[PDB]
Amino acid sequence: AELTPEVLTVPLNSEGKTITLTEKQYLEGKRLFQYACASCHVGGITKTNPSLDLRTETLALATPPRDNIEGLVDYMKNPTTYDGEQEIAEVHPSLRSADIFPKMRNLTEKDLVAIAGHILVEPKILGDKWGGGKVYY
Amino acid sequence: MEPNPNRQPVELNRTSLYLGLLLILVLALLFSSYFFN
Amino acid sequence: TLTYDDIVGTGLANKCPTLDDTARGAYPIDSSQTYRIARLCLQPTTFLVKEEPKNKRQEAEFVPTKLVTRETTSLDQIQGELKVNSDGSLTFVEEDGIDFQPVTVQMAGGERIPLLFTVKNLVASTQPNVTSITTSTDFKGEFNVPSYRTANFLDPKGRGLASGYDSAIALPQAKEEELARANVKRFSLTKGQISLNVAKVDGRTGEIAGTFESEQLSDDDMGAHEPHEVKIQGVFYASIEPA
Amino acid sequence: MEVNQLGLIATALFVLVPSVFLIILYVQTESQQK
Amino acid sequence: MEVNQLGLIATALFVLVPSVFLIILYVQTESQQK
Amino acid sequence: VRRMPAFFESFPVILTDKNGVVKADIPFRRAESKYSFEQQGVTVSFYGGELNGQTFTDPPTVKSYARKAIFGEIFEFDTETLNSDGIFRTSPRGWFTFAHA
Amino acid sequence: LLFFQGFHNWTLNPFHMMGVAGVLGGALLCAIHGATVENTLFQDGEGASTFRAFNPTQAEETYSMVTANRFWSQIFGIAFSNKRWLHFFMLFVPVTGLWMSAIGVVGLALNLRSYDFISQEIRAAEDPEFETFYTKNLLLNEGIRAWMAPQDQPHENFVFPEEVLPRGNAL
Amino acid sequence: METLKITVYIVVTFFVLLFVFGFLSGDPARNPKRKDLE
Amino acid sequence: METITYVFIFACIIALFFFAIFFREPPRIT
Amino acid sequence: ANLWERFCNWVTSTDNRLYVGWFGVIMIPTLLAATICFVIAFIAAPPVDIDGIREPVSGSLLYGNNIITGAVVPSSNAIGLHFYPIWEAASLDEWLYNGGPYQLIIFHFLLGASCYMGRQWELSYRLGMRPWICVAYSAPLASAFAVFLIYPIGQGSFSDGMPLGISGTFNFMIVFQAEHNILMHPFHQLGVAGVFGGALFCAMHGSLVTSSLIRETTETESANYGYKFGQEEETYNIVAAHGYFGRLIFQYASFNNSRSLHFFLAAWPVVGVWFAALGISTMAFNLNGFNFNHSVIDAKGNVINTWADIINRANLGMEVMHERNAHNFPLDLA
Amino acid sequence: KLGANVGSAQGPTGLGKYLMRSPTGEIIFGGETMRFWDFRGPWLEPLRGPNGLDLNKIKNDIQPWQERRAAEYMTHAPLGSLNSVGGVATEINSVNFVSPRSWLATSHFVLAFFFLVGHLWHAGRARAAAAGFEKGIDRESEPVLSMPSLD
Amino acid sequence: ELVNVVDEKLGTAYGEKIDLNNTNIAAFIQYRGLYPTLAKLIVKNAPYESVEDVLNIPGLTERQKQILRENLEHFTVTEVETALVEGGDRYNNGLYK
Ligand code: CLA
Ligand code: CLA
Ligand code: CLA
Ligand SMILES: CCCCCCCCCCCCCCCC(=O)OC[C@H](CO[C@@H]1O[C@H](CS(=O)(=O)O)[C@@H](O)[C@H](O)[C@H]1O)OC(=O)CCCCCCCCCCCCCCC
Ligand SMILES: CCCCCCCCCCCCCCCC(=O)OC[C@H](COP(=O)(O)OC[C@@H](O)CO)OC(=O)CCCCCCCCCCCCCCC
Ligand SMILES: CCCCCCCCCCCCCCCC(=O)OC[C@H](COP(=O)(O)OC[C@@H](O)CO)OC(=O)CCCCCCCCCCCCCCC
Ligand SMILES: CCCCCCCCCCCCCCCC(=O)OC[C@H](COP(=O)(O)OC[C@@H](O)CO)OC(=O)CCCCCCCCCCCCCCC
Ligand code: HEM
Ligand SMILES: CCCCCCCCCCCCO[C@@H]1O[C@H](CO)[C@@H](O[C@H]2O[C@H](CO)[C@@H](O)[C@H](O)[C@H]2O)[C@H](O)[C@H]1O
Ligand SMILES: CCCCCCCCCCCCO[C@@H]1O[C@H](CO)[C@@H](O[C@H]2O[C@H](CO)[C@@H](O)[C@H](O)[C@H]2O)[C@H](O)[C@H]1O
Ligand SMILES: CCCCCCCS[C@@H]1O[C@H](CO)[C@@H](O)[C@H](O)[C@H]1O
Ligand SMILES: CCCCCCCS[C@@H]1O[C@H](CO)[C@@H](O)[C@H](O)[C@H]1O
Ligand code: OEY
Ligand SMILES: [Ca+2]
Ligand SMILES: [Ca+2]
Ligand SMILES: [Cl-]
Ligand SMILES: [Cl-]
Ligand SMILES: [Cl-]
Ligand SMILES: [Fe+2]
């Protein structure tokens, strides 16, 4: 097996358009995820709220839909509750709250894109392991 | 320590061994039914 | 006016506030104003357990016991509605608070009695025509006593109700009938009764204090055995304020 | 049969303790200088 | 507890038989001359 | 019913179809159970032996027989005569092998 | 190691225990004997490093058995007095230990384990408040078997749905 | 309990004092060779 | 009786400590 | 010669059957207290709420244990590292329910064994010996400190101190492996090298010396009568022993110098065990064994398991099952 | 936030799931962390009143920064592997983290221990050197030989 | 006579749908728009005699009523089970990942 362009190809928006990531993009995405996210989201779960995970189906059932690049970039700029009802920038890392979450401070649009790509590609690779937690270790 | 002058060797000859074992074994054969009850 | 550091480790945190011997006044009740209990506190001083006689026709007594779980026994920070009913009586409806404590007391001879000391969902009313709460006022009412252990609790062989094995796995080919009562966990839910006798009233501050006696069942180990009857006696504090 | 369960250990010690006493005395007698 | 009913006699004989073997040997040694 | 391998003193109760896809089981945690006998309406029918022609549908009984099914074919035992304790013991094949090794 | 704990409860086996006693007792004898000789040495030279003051062909013991014996008699209550017995015993303890552990493992070849105490199980089965370190350890073992078997025994093709995995609260 | 506490304290202080004054009592000189160790 | 057995054996072991220490065969220098 | 002088002379006397000494003035009573409380608790103590969740664990013989299952049970998690002497309790019944005996016993024992080490120094000095036997003893003592004091300090509770019983010891070990992966820690590995190595070298020294005993006996008597206590001559041929061992390997792996040999015999297990103790005492502050979970990944990104990952699955079994009613939150942070 | 009344939530054991009493009465956090109730920190102390954690402050006064900080600390617990894989021993590789407190605590425990050993070494040796037998026992004047037999 | 009420409940519609009267709140994550706002309101105002009674929760927005109507088909109601609703277990039932 290998990390093919097809594996690297993920939905860009809710309308059906895809984007195909470079290997470099995917790897920088993994690195930025580790740097700014893994402390809570290692393996695709959420340590401070295990009810909500990073599985693609979960993101898809989120409001607004987060199962695509733009949705995730938007989340990283202005995170909301699962139902879209509350903005939660105050207790969740984002560009909007980079003053209180400093590891978001130097993140560029491309960075958010690459992270989003990691979050969408990773389950294509690991399957149930992503957001699966210790049961699947 | 200085040795105690009151010590004596002890003996049990073979006939006494046999008599004693007879007494013990027969007393056991007699009393065992009662111990089991 | 004590702080945490004044208090920590003294044992004072398990004691309810007290009122002076001067507090023997009356707290006026305006039928039009809405009332609440901002803080109800219940400090158990004695745990009595009804003995279980052998002839079953002898009068069973409540006997003294030894507390073995230390100063962890008091109910506090309980709040709720204080209704003024048609007949002038008042009715406290418990809404929230630290309104339970697991307690283990030990009987003479060693038997340990765990119980969930509680006033959960208490509803308790006075006599009619309580124009002013005085030291003649009292509250009688009832509360819920749920299972000492909740549903996830696993026994030492890993059996439970909402989780765990449903069988005695260390005895794979034993007959299960004789083990049913241990294998099949059950969740108890019974009633308790309590009286609060007001001994002291500060009518300026709306504070009251006094004695209580409550009666309730003890742990039944999720249906593994019969509970015991327990009688808890202590002191209470309450702050009445117009909501 | 529903016999007494201590009966066995009772009979066993009843035989062995004194028999062993005698065997000890006998053997240490034999080994004494002839 | 529901223990094995032969545990008691087993343990007792486990102790006594070899202990007694040794006591016999020891005592007949002490009783030898010199 | 998935059979118990010799290695295991205890074993879970898991039921699959002919292709080995999990279809039923006895859950440890109940809160997110998908395959419980009650959910899946598991029944058990017997052919041959003492229970020939009989069918059971109440979950406790079905579960009991499944529990037995992990041991292979199911038998009635007299456990009172010797005061049997329900715990497997080896055969003379075992004991002989042990002693002689 | 972990497999033998989870499936065989090997730590409970008296043969393993004798093994452990022979091994740790061996290490103890090694240490204590070495230290004792090195701290009852005769002064046989002027150097503050005492290693040079020994000669392979020397007839004399290089340390005092008498002083060593007094020391251990006064500290521990008993002491070696026979050097030959001391060294034979140093052979005997770990060799005997390893042999016993071998016997236990031979039992385990047949799953002939020291896995349970039947009295404990009868009591615990009847009595959901009875707990000991023994039953606690069995729960750990059950955890080990369930969580490790699918990947450790791939030929069995174990599929254990999440709901059947034994787990305590939260974890 | 108060009596038990006081008792244990007295006991412990006693033995600790024995230890401290004991090792203060010319202990370097209690060896089978050189004693002028002050 | 199990408890009595365990405690008995233990007690015998302590006794043995006593004899092995205070009633040992004395070491003697030749 | 007043009374104090005579007392000191008797305490430090080289003529007592058991040396007392100043370290002994502390050792004797603390060890007696620890032992007496231990025997009584092991026989008769009621069950103990070890994990502070009102789930008492029975350790004593009279309450359903045998020699293998019995334990004196660690004090309650609700106590944590708080000092819990008898007089802090409202009653002996309370005290027993909460695991007070464990604290009394381990504190007295640690004091006592420390003084035991001191005492080895002391008698060595009174006898004109070199001083370092006690340093050899510092290794098992350090280990005891690790499991009875340091690990509880690190984790914030004596309820995680090693239980005083056989099966309790195994419990401690298994949970330790779950939470610290101690098998993959190099200090525990050095510990194993130390006790395996200690055993090996024990048998080695024993068998070589045995094998080169000079002939002093006949066939019908024990070879041991060939050695007389206090004799000045060595009882075996160290040249023969050396010759054998050098031919067995090669000439230079062998010790011809008995002093260096015996020093090695002391040093190998003592250092190994020092590191074992340091293993427990640093895993006390949660610097754990090596973690190679999912360390090997293929070109796509699939995890290729190694034996490290199987170890992880076993550890997970232990983790999820241990203290099954004690955790309310997803992470076991102590 | 989800609607729980944390003051009154009975956990599985019968103790409070979130809040319980210390052995002397103070209101403290439930679960295993019952052992750590002596802890004090500037993010938690505002929730504290005379009898411990205050249910009313908890219901009404917990600020965003407090939530942030609690989450940060909960996810930077001093647990980690020797090769700096952050978290519990069973965690997968992903986070490069071992707390400075673990590094400093462990390093200085090892150093303190070996220095205790060094103390025994050089103390015993200094005693034996000042007394004159650090190089061994004098064959012609062996002290034990002039002492009476123990028995 | 002796019956595990949780296993028993698994054979009712509680084992097929979100029981508004018993199911732990995390279940509401299964469908779009229900968690945490509506999930909280629903668990708070239980029990319900029927699923459509969920529409009558005081304070619901018009949008929330719409979403709820979209999800009635995923809901059920059964008799309140003490074992599932004590201990604040509807808000936290001891299950994480
Ligand atoms: C207090 C801790 C402790 C101690 C001291 C022991 C001690 C022992 N364990 Mg136990 N163990 C423990 C805890 C402990 N265990 C726990 C908690 C568990 C979990 C249940 C186990 C699980 C366990 C298992 C599964 C086994 C043991 C075994 C043993 C024995 C191994 C002896 C040995 O040296 O084999 C070492 C191997 C040999 C001596 C064979 C010969 C080796 C040759 C000579 C080596 C040649 C090397 C050559 C030169 C090549 C070198 C190349 C180089 C590159 C490496 C020993 C008695 C083993 C046993 O009982 O065997 C019968 C065993 O199989 N243990
Ligand atoms: C060698 C004698 C000795 C020592 C050192 C100890 C030590 C201890 N006992 Mg024990 N005990 C002993 C004999 C001893 N006991 C005897 C004979 C009995 C039967 C009566 C007991 C019965 C007993 C019970 C029932 C209990 C203890 C407990 C304790 C612990 C708490 C002690 C305390 O709080 O005192 C504190 C003392 C003071 C505050 C005053 C000390 C005054 C001196 C001058 C201070 C100097 C200390 C300082 C560190 C300097 C040391 C010198 C250094 C330079 C070498 C402590 C481990 C308790 C326990 O185990 O709790 C878990 C407990 O409950 N003991
Ligand atoms: C107090 C001592 C101490 C402590 C607590 C730390 C802690 C740290 N160092 Mg620092 N450092 C130190 C001294 C220390 N260091 C020394 C002496 C040097 C010069 C070599 C350095 C040079 C250094 C560099 C270049 C780096 C660090 C880094 C780090 C971090 C990662 C550590 C790691 O991964 O090690 C891995 C673990 C080991 C290597 C384990 C070693 C085990 C030892 C050898 C056991 C020794 C025990 C004892 C001394 C032996 C006695 C022998 C006995 C027979 C008597 C960590 C915060 C890294 C970092 O993150 O910087 C930002 C990094 O890149 N350190
Ligand atoms: C429920 C709680 C109850 C607990 C009660 C316990 C209190 C016991 C007090 C009894 C007093 C008499 C006992 C003396 C017996 C004795 O040993 O004498 C033996 C010798 C002979 O005495 C020597 O005797 C000589 C002459 S004569 O024999 O005494 O006449 C004399 O000249 C010399 O000075 C003297 O040293 O005494 C000595 O060698 C010095 C004292 C040794 C002290 C040993 C204490 C051991 C502590 C162990 C701790 C761990 C225990 C667990 C191990 C299994
Ligand atoms: C709770 C603590 C328990 C402690 C256990 C103590 C156990 C001690 C048991 C002692 C047993 C003594 C046996 C001595 C046996 C013995 O030594 O006999 C021979 C012995 C001869 O004595 P002499 O003076 O010749 O001495 C020779 C010496 O060698 C004897 O030491 O006579 C007696 O001892 C007097 C009593 C005679 C009794 C003999 C009766 C035998 C008749 C057979 C009866 C059975 C058959 C009947 C058929 C119907
Ligand atoms: C210095 C390092 C400290 C740790 C090792 C120390 C060795 C001694 C410790 C064991 C004591 C046993 C009980 C006392 C036993 C006893 O009494 O020993 C006595 C023995 C001989 O004593 P001497 O009096 O002749 O010499 C010591 C002094 O008097 C100086 O001359 O001591 C030594 O040989 C010390 C040599 C240390 C020289 C440095 C050693 C370096 C070791 C490196 C190990 C690294 C391993 C890393 C892991 C693989
Ligand atoms: C402050 C005082 C602290 C001391 C506490 C009590 C110490 C007890 C020491 C053992 C006394 C019994 C000795 C019998 C045996 C006896 O009397 O030894 C005597 C024997 C004397 O050796 P020799 O070299 O003089 O003997 C040579 C020839 O006589 C052989 O033919 O000593 C040894 O062989 C050392 C190796 C055995 C060491 C075994 C130690 C066992 C430790 C405990 C194990 C069981 C624990 C059970 C727990 C429930
Ligand atoms: C790192 C920059 C980072 C990313 C990226 C990230 C993503 C993310 C997503 C997409 C969600 C929504 C999941 C879903 O809809 O199913 C989400 C939710 C939560 N996260 Fe997050 N997150 C990142 C960083 C962090 C960090 C550092 C923490 C811990 C402090 C954290 C935690 C959470 C929590 C809690 C949620 C749930 C919020 C809610 O709905 O109430 N995240 N994250
Ligand atoms: C569990 C139940 C077991 C019951 C155990 C009963 C124990 C009985 C112990 C008997 C003691 C025997 O006592 C033993 O007697 C012999 C003589 O008889 C003594 O022997 C002495 O006398 C003989 C003959 O003059 C001499 O050769 C010898 O040199 C001298 O020492 C031993 O020194 C003594 O140890
Ligand atoms: C933190 C506390 C600070 C307090 C201030 C410090 C003051 C310290 C004063 C210590 C006094 C020590 O006093 C010490 O007593 C003992 C006992 O008599 C003496 O001991 C002397 O007499 C005894 C008894 O005859 C002899 O056995 C011993 O050989 C001899 O040295 C010491 O030689 C002496 O120096
Ligand atoms: C030397 C005697 C020391 C042993 C004392 C044991 C505690 S005393 C013991 O306690 C039990 C439980 O409370 C009672 O059932 C029992 O009647 C009582 O004798
Ligand atoms: C609800 C219970 C249904 C009854 C079926 C149980 C499985 S079968 C059952 O197994 C027992 C061993 O466990 C045997 O002793 C017994 O002979 C046998 O009838
Ligand atoms: O391991 Mn796991 O981690 Ca040290 O606490 Mn948390 O659970 Mn519990 O108290 Mn004994 O044990
Ligand atoms: Ca009144
Ligand atoms: Ca039966
Ligand atoms: Cl899910
Ligand atoms: Cl555990
Ligand atoms: Cl917890
Ligand atoms: Fe040697």
mmCIF file of C-alpha atoms in Angstrom, chain L:
data_model
loop_
_atom_site.group_PDB
_atom_site.id
_atom_site.type_symbol
_atom_site.label_atom_id
_atom_site.label_comp_id
_atom_site.label_asym_id
_atom_site.label_seq_id
_atom_site.Cartn_x
_atom_site.Cartn_y
_atom_site.Cartn_z
ATOM 1 C CA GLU L 1 -38.533 -13.690 39.457
ATOM 2 C CA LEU L 2 -35.149 -11.936 39.343
ATOM 3 C CA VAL L 3 -34.557 -9.823 36.293
ATOM 4 C CA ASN L 4 -31.882 -7.427 35.118
ATOM 5 C CA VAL L 5 -33.982 -4.402 34.210
ATOM 6 C CA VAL L 6 -31.357 -2.947 31.880
ATOM 7 C CA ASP L 7 -31.087 -6.070 29.722
ATOM 8 C CA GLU L 8 -34.878 -6.220 29.802
ATOM 9 C CA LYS L 9 -35.098 -2.617 28.643
ATOM 10 C CA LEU L 10 -32.820 -3.497 25.723
ATOM 11 C CA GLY L 11 -35.721 -5.571 24.353
ATOM 12 C CA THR L 12 -38.006 -2.540 24.274
ATOM 13 C CA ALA L 13 -37.803 0.455 21.955
ATOM 14 C CA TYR L 14 -35.108 1.781 24.291
ATOM 15 C CA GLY L 15 -32.817 -0.629 22.430
ATOM 16 C CA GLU L 16 -33.918 0.723 19.035
ATOM 17 C CA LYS L 17 -34.189 4.498 19.413
ATOM 18 C CA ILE L 18 -33.320 7.413 21.689
ATOM 19 C CA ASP L 19 -35.611 7.029 24.683
ATOM 20 C CA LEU L 20 -36.417 10.588 25.757
ATOM 21 C CA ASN L 21 -37.186 9.242 29.226
ATOM 22 C CA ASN L 22 -34.009 7.166 29.839
ATOM 23 C CA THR L 23 -31.209 7.318 27.275
ATOM 24 C CA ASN L 24 -27.921 8.934 28.218
ATOM 25 C CA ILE L 25 -27.505 12.377 26.640
ATOM 26 C CA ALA L 26 -24.510 11.423 24.442
ATOM 27 C CA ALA L 27 -26.878 9.478 22.175
ATOM 28 C CA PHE L 28 -28.245 12.783 20.852
ATOM 29 C CA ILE L 29 -24.990 13.244 18.961
ATOM 30 C CA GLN L 30 -26.274 10.596 16.492
ATOM 31 C CA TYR L 31 -28.387 13.092 14.502
ATOM 32 C CA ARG L 32 -27.850 16.608 13.169
ATOM 33 C CA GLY L 33 -28.749 19.564 15.365
ATOM 34 C CA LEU L 34 -29.707 17.869 18.647
ATOM 35 C CA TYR L 35 -26.533 18.236 20.788
ATOM 36 C CA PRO L 36 -25.932 19.990 23.182
ATOM 37 C CA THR L 37 -28.757 22.599 23.286
ATOM 38 C CA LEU L 38 -31.809 20.480 22.552
ATOM 39 C CA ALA L 39 -30.198 17.464 24.246
ATOM 40 C CA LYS L 40 -29.999 19.477 27.441
ATOM 41 C CA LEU L 41 -33.568 20.778 27.201
ATOM 42 C CA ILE L 42 -34.915 17.288 26.458
ATOM 43 C CA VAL L 43 -33.136 15.531 29.290
ATOM 44 C CA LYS L 44 -34.057 18.377 31.642
ATOM 45 C CA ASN L 45 -37.791 18.330 30.906
ATOM 46 C CA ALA L 46 -38.308 14.523 30.886
ATOM 47 C CA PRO L 47 -40.274 12.373 31.314
ATOM 48 C CA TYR L 48 -42.684 12.508 28.388
ATOM 49 C CA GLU L 49 -45.906 10.547 27.880
ATOM 50 C CA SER L 50 -45.287 10.520 24.167
ATOM 51 C CA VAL L 51 -42.506 11.537 21.820
ATOM 52 C CA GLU L 52 -44.540 14.439 20.379
ATOM 53 C CA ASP L 53 -44.808 15.840 23.914
ATOM 54 C CA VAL L 54 -41.132 16.777 23.443
ATOM 55 C CA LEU L 55 -42.493 19.576 21.207
ATOM 56 C CA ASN L 56 -44.039 21.304 24.205
ATOM 57 C CA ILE L 57 -40.854 22.062 26.163
ATOM 58 C CA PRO L 58 -41.152 25.651 27.433
ATOM 59 C CA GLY L 59 -38.970 28.172 25.626
ATOM 60 C CA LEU L 60 -38.290 26.184 22.442
ATOM 61 C CA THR L 61 -37.589 28.314 19.387
ATOM 62 C CA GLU L 62 -39.579 27.730 16.203
ATOM 63 C CA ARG L 63 -36.453 26.349 14.554
ATOM 64 C CA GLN L 64 -35.919 23.961 17.459
ATOM 65 C CA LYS L 65 -39.505 22.725 17.139
ATOM 66 C CA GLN L 66 -38.833 22.063 13.443
ATOM 67 C CA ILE L 67 -35.643 20.114 14.149
ATOM 68 C CA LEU L 68 -37.399 18.099 16.843
ATOM 69 C CA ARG L 69 -40.196 17.252 14.374
ATOM 70 C CA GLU L 70 -37.519 16.083 11.929
ATOM 71 C CA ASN L 71 -36.230 13.703 14.597
ATOM 72 C CA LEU L 72 -39.386 12.312 16.273
ATOM 73 C CA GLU L 73 -38.876 9.191 14.156
ATOM 74 C CA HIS L 74 -35.558 8.564 15.905
ATOM 75 C CA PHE L 75 -37.091 8.970 19.340
ATOM 76 C CA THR L 76 -39.100 6.750 21.616
ATOM 77 C CA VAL L 77 -40.496 6.877 25.132
ATOM 78 C CA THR L 78 -40.708 4.068 27.661
ATOM 79 C CA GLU L 79 -41.345 3.954 31.401
ATOM 80 C CA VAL L 80 -38.666 5.728 33.414
ATOM 81 C CA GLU L 81 -36.136 3.237 34.698
ATOM 82 C CA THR L 82 -34.616 4.255 38.048
ATOM 83 C CA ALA L 83 -31.381 2.405 37.273
ATOM 84 C CA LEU L 84 -30.791 4.485 34.138
ATOM 85 C CA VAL L 85 -31.684 7.893 35.524
ATOM 86 C CA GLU L 86 -30.280 7.896 39.104
ATOM 87 C CA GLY L 87 -26.728 9.038 39.799
ATOM 88 C CA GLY L 88 -27.026 11.782 37.208
ATOM 89 C CA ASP L 89 -26.288 8.935 34.797
ATOM 90 C CA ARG L 90 -28.266 10.494 31.941
ATOM 91 C CA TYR L 91 -25.630 13.275 31.890
ATOM 92 C CA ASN L 92 -22.651 11.035 32.524
ATOM 93 C CA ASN L 93 -22.992 7.231 32.547
ATOM 94 C CA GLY L 94 -19.364 6.304 33.095
ATOM 95 C CA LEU L 95 -18.761 5.646 29.418
ATOM 96 C CA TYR L 96 -16.149 7.551 27.469
ATOM 97 C CA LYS L 97 -14.261 6.144 24.490
#
